[PDB]
Design a protein around this ligand. Structure first.
Ligand code: NAG
Ligand code: NAG
Lengths: 365, 335, 202, 205
């Protein structure tokens, strides 16, 4: 009965207890005591430098095959798990993000050892494409911020349409004078505006559209989650349709679901020949984990339908597949769920969709 | 003012000799990188750093960029993993490395092919970084430019699958010239496998970037004889000469720092525990001893000391070309 | 405060058997129960965290925990504490001293007269009984045949980690004139391994 | 390569003040917490308090409030322990333990500082050698205070029986123990910090 360690960097000491519970339940279910999993974990440290050292001294030193990481927004890391994506990425040790949804972690050139139990904000275009198929929309307007986040949401939507259905507009972020682009949009002759921006950049687009009278009547606003949360929600058109990722902020659910995937990937890993143990510590070890690249390929190729957050499969770049969203619609200053994205189709809810300013429709047929 | 210098045992360093702090560091692991820099910053108010390792680890560059973004210390990658091409550097970092971009090396490679009219070729890459960029620039240049070419499509593969899963993809190449892009570690497996298929013979031409050649002082046994490559490690460009070429980038940037502000930003207190201006502005356009030592927002060198090399039958690299004069290359007329 | 009660606080497992100690909490500490090991003269060492250090196993939850040595090595002789890490104040268990069984070994007796530099100042007679098992042993001093239990200071060694035996030094502290009164000083002993009482005199 | 080194044993009369140190070496100091445990001779383990390092926040136990302080010098990587108004019941060995994850378990301990809060003369010992298949010898060390005493049999060359000391009327006493030597020859060695004396002896037949 050999020992196989699973690393984790969580936010609270209480979440560590759930992590050890998830590993314990992983050993009760199908482990057969053929391989015993251990739960090595530390609470997230504010200091980035101090966090990167705690990976080496507490996690890497315990010969961890993979590291889980949740990143709520208390301190100093740019709100992105960079100091652990690099440290474990030095040895090709798979890092599994639980909460972070930044589209920059999809590129396996910057984070070649990173996975996600949550989809990036760019994969919300999978709902936009299905919603265009639902209402047979063939001419939409795509307004995206000019960053790697908005460029990702644009490329994902176009690749879903490729395999001339949209004219795209861009704008320099941080600007508070985007009337030149909406005037560009108001003459583009299309009623479906798809916006992809930050919470503050959405407020700029919303109130700038309030001037040119594009906030109601013959217009359809379809957005994601950052555009209907926080300040953007307060200035959001009445009748706007945004998305809310189901179980996107449930750290406890993502913990028990990630452990379930790792355990299944760990056991099918040890059905292969020539396996080497993960590096014991950082100091004195300058080469990658020879089994690392193979184990990451196993993790991404894994399929776990009985997940607590739905079917758990991973993308070519390690992003999560089959993630289910909630289709909200702002009605009288209140976000109303008019349906959910099942994962393969759009489930039509009992409530009714209120368009901007006095007409109605539904997610039926 | 104070400048640290961390180098390895490569290219025969012994005594390096404003104030300079030198040390021989053969620990290129994440903690030691964080430790020895923070241990310098605290107890030796270094205002800049010239780093160099003896490994081929691409990740060291990614760690120095992370350390520089947290310590606000200008770091210069001079040799080894710290000069290896990496994803674009952090915009908030002061980490720069002596190395040609992916694009510059690509142009050089194509320039060699144009010289010998190698119009028909193939492309073989792995998912390793630069895989997105390398084909685009190459695909863009050939398609847009007017000349005769046969890309023969792009062959990509994963160097972690079962062996002979790599082979089936490999037997699909129909070109004398083959452009191979991956890490040095991956390249070993690829070329080892291709050798058995007879694709490493002299009737074929494998061209690899500086990612694959890596240190021009460590040649694996699997690298086939006659391997054409571009690399910035010039073994006559002395390591000892590099730091003096790197010190000039910092001192001339710090001197300028008294202009448009007359104070040098003191080093941070400590990396541990609970930046008015950046020298970043002053290092992208440095001139020193007729050498345009200049960098870009991306972080790679503007005038990169890139050299065309081939693997000799004697198992030693040898220079058979030059670049970095200005635009254009200077082959030696032998193939 | 939480009262961590550990019983029994003593064990004598045979080598190669399987030790199973017990640590019961007053309340429920969930899984925040760590195990420690103290060598004879060393700081306690963390054995298990959260329930060679590969022969130790840790099961249990809530208020019933057990640490299990699968194949007890003779170098595992020592104390074993359990710590409530759940709630302040951090409390420890009562501890359990783990001695082991061994082959019956007879002691190596050696008596020594008072040092010439000792009785010059004014006369301790020392007697060494080392490397024996079991621990139970009777020791009787006898001066000229007459037994005397006063002035005797006995100190015992902890059980060896490689030999698993015991040792004891009896010391007959006398004054210079009282010692020069008699010449027959014996260091007799009764043990499990002695048909006849083990004696050594001068 | 993680090590925790404490200051040596100290003897202070009842009512005085003592400070003990734990030198950290091998780990990131601010990444953990420091725990202080006290062991009376044989009594067991009593947790005194825990101190966070990123935040210098002491958290004492109710029984160790008022006259117990947790100092901290992160620049020198050392956690201290100050005790005022020494009472005789404070005669114990005080450990420092690194707290994994700042509240978790104690994965690394110090060697242990031995404190003796007594009022006595602190006299140096009197080493008396002992002498009569295999040869066994003995070296008597009587009449010293306090307990911390180091004994190497032959220049420390020989490891592989030194008995515990017996306290009787403010004075301690212990003893320590091949025919190939058949007294080369063996000479005794005795050292001790408090009495600043490190005399020796020699066994002769
Ligand atoms: C799901 O998340 C919410 C918000 O964090 C939390 O209140 C709730 O208890 C979680 N449920 C489970 C079963 O983990
Ligand atoms: C989504 O709904 C369709 C319709 O029956 C069904 O085929 C599919 O299995 C559903 N997926 C999930 C995850 O419920």
């Amino acid at each position: 009965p050999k020992i196989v360690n699973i690393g984790a960097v969580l936010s609270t000491k209480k979440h560590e207890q759930i992590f050890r519970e998830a590993v314990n339940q992983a050993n009760k279910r199908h482990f057969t005591r053929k391989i015993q999993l251990q739960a090595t974990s530390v609470t997230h440290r504010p200091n980035a430098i101090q966090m990167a050292l705690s990976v080496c001294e507490d996690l890497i030193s315990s010969q961890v095959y993979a590291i889980l990481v949740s990143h709520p927004p208390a301190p100093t890391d740019h709100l992105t798990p960079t100091p652990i994506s690099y440290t474990a990425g030095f040895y090709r040790i798979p890092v599994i993000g639980l909460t972070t949804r930044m589209s920059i972690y999809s590129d396996k050139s910057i984070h070649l050892s990173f996975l996600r139990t949550v989809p990036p904000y760019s994969h919300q275009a999978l709902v936009w494409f299905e919603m265009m198929r639902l209402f047979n929309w063939n001419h939409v307007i795509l307004i995206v911020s000019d960053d790697h986040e908005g460029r990702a949401a644009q490329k994902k939507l176009e690749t879903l349409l490729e395999g001339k259905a949209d004219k795209v507009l861009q704008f320099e972020p941080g600007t508070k004078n985007l009337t030149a682009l909406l005037l560009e949009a108001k003459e583009l002759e299309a009623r479906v505006i798809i916006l992809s921006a930050s919470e503050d950049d959405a407020t700029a687009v919303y109130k700038s559209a309030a001037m040119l009278d594009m906030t109601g009547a013959g217009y359809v606003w379809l957005v994601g989650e950052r555009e209907i949360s926080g300040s953007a929600l307060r200035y959001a058109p009445d009748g706007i349709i945004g998305l809310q990722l189901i179980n996107g902020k449930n750290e406890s659910a993502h913990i028990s679901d990630a452990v379930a995937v790792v355990a299944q990937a760990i056991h099918e890993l040890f059905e292969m020949e020539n396996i080497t143990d993960p590096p014991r510590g950082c100091v004195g070890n300058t080469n990658i984990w020879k089994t690392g690249p193979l184990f990451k390929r196993v993790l991404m190729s894994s399929k776990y339908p009985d997940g607590v957050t739905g079917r758990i499969e991973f993308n070519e770049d390690g992003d999560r597949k089959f993630a289910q969203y909630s289709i909200m619609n702002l009605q009288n200053r209140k976000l109303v769920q008019v349906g959910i994205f099942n994962g393969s189709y759009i489930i039509q809810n009992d409530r009714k969709i209120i368009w901007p300013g006095g007409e109605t429709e539904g997610t039926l047929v | 003012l104070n400048i640290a210098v961390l180098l390895g045992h490569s290219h025969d360093v012994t005594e390096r000799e404003v104030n300079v702090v030198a040390l021989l560091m053969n620990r290129t692991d994440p903690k030691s990188l964080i430790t020895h820099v923070c241990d310098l910053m605290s107890g030796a108010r270094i205002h800049g750093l010239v780093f160099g390792d003896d490994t081929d680890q691409e990740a060291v560059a990614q760690m120095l960029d992370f350390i520089s973004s947290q310590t606000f210390i200008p770091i210069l990658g001079i040799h080894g993993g710290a000069s290896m091409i990496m994803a674009d550097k952090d915009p908030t970092s002061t980490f720069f490395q002596f190395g040609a971009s992916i694009q510059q090396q690509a142009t050089v490679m194509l320039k060699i092919m144009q010289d010998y009219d190698w119009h028909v070729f193939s492309l073989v890459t792995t998912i390793f970084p630069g895989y997105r960029d390398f084909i685009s620039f190459i695909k863009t240049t050939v398609d847009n430019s007017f000349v005769g070419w046969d890309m023969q499509n792009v062959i990509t593969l994963d160097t972690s699958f079962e062996d002979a899963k790599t082979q089936v993809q490999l037997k699909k190449i129909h070109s004398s010239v083959i452009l191979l892009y991956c890490s040095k570690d991956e390249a070993v497996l690829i070329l080892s496998e291709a050798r058995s298929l007879g694709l490493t013979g002299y009737d074929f031409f494998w061209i690899v970037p500086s990612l694959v050649s890596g240190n021009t002082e460590l040649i694996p046994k699997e690298f086939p004889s006659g391997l054409i490559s571009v690399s910035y490690d010039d073994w006559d460009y002395s390591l000892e000469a590099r730091v003096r070429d790197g010190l000039g980038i910092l001192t001339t940037a710090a001197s300028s720092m008294l202009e448009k502000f007359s104070y040098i930003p003191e080093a941070k207190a400590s990396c541990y525990g609970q930046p008015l201006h950046t020298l970043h502005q002053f290092m992208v356009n440095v001139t020193w001893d007729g050498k345009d030592l200049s960098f870009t927002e991306e972080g790679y060198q503007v005038h990169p000391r890139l050299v065309v090399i081939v693997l000799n039958k004697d198992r030693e690299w040898e220079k058979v070309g030059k670049w970095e004069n200005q635009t254009l290359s200077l082959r030696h007329a032998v193939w | 405060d939480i009262v961590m009660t550990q019983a029994p606080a003593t064990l004598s497992v045979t080598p190669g058997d399987r030790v199973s100690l017990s640590c019961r909490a007053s309340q429920s500490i969930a899984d925040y129960l760590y195990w420690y090991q103290q060598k004879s003269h060393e700081s306690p060492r963390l054995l298990l965290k959260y329930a060679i250090p590969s022969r130790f196993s840790g099961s249990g939850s809530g208020s019933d925990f057990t640490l299990t040595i699968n194949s007890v090595e003779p170098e595992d002789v020592g104390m074993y504490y359990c710590q409530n890490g759940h709630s302040f104040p951090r409390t420890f268990g009562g501890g359990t001293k783990l001695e082991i069984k061994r082959a019956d070994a007879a002691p190596t007796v050696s008596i020594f007269p008072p040092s010439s530099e000792q009785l010059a100042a004014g006369a301790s007679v020392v007697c060494f009984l080392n490397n024996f098992y079991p621990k139970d042993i009777n020791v009787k001093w006898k001066i000229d045949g007459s037994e005397r239990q006063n002035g005797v200071l006995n100190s015992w060694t902890d059980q060896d980690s490689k030999d698993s035996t015991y040792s004891m030094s009896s010391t007959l502290t006398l004054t210079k004139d009282e010692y020069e009164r008699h010449n027959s000083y014996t260091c007799e002993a009764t043990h499990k391994t002695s048909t006849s009482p083990i004696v050594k005199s001068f | 390569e993680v090590k925790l080194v404490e200051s040596g044993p100290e003897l202070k009369k009842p009512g005085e003040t003592v400070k003990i140190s734990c030198k950290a070496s091998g780990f990131t100091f601010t990444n953990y917490g420091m725990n202080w445990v006290k062991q009376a001779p044989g009594k067991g383990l009593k947790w005194m308090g825990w101190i966070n390092i990123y935040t210098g926040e002491p958290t004492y136990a109710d029984d160790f409030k008022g006259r117990f302080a947790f100092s901290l010098e992160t620049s020198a990587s050392t956690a201290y322990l100050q005790i005022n108004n020494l009472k005789n019941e404070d005669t114990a060995t005080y450990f420092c333990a690194r707290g994994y994850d700042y509240e978790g378990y104690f994965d690394y301990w110090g060697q242990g500082t031995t404190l003796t809060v007594s009022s006595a003369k602190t006299t140096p010992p009197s080493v008396y050698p002992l002498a009569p298949s295999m040869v066994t010898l003995g070296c008597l060390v009587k009449g010293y205070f306090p307990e911390p005493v180091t004994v190497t049999w032959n220049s420390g060359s020989l490891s592989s029986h030194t008995f515990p000391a017996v306290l009787q009327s403010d004075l301690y006493t212990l003893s320590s123990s091949p025919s190939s030597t058949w007294p080369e020859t063996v000479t005794c060695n005795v050292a001790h910090p408090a009495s600043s004396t490190k005399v020796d002896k020699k066994i002769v037949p």
